[PDB]
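Supplementary notes (optional reading)

For those who missed the lab, this is the record we used. Protein: Peptidyl-prolyl cis-trans isomerase FKBP5. Length: 128 residues.
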Amino acid sequence: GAPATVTEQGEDITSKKDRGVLKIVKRVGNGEETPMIGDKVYVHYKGKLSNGKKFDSSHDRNEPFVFSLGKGQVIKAWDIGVATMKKGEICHLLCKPEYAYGSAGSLPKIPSNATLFFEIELLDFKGE
Ligand SMILES: COc1ccc(CC[C@@H](OC(=O)[C@@H]2CCCCN2C(=O)[C@@H]2CCC(=O)[C@@H]3CCCC[C@H]32)c2cccc(OCCN3CCOCC3)c2)cc1OC
């Protein structure tokens, strides 16, 4: 399964090197440019609990998910992982609960100590 493949081949992109956020590039994006803190970022994604029956996709709602990079508007794994991406890149991300919703989780939807998996496509980014 895709989560096991990130475990095996995924680069640790954390500062602390605690494997809390693992990344594999599934499709290479354009040029060299990666987004800056405060850039307005547009993505499509697919998210699920790593071993769990909860699945969420922006493709469903026919609208890119938009947020402000590095400002704590998303879980930590995403502030870390999306800052590494190029435009048009698709990556897989495996996120320990430390970089997601933690010991608390976010009930009823997200349980305690949940490891999350994402496929993220970076569509665009532009300066705020
Ligand atoms: C600093 O720490 C946190 C920061 C923010 C949040 C809010 C949750 C935030 O969602 C997320 O961080 C991630 C990454 C972006 C995709 C959504 N996501 C998830 O976990 C999804 C949420 C929906 C869901 O039930 C999914 C189940 C399968 C796992 C992925 C889950 C989310 C959800 C919905 C909308 C969001 O919008 C950003 C809003 N911005 C820009 C527009 O104006 C308001 C600000 C953001 C929690 C945090 O917990 C530690």
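If you only remember one thing from this example: The longest strand covers residues 116-126.
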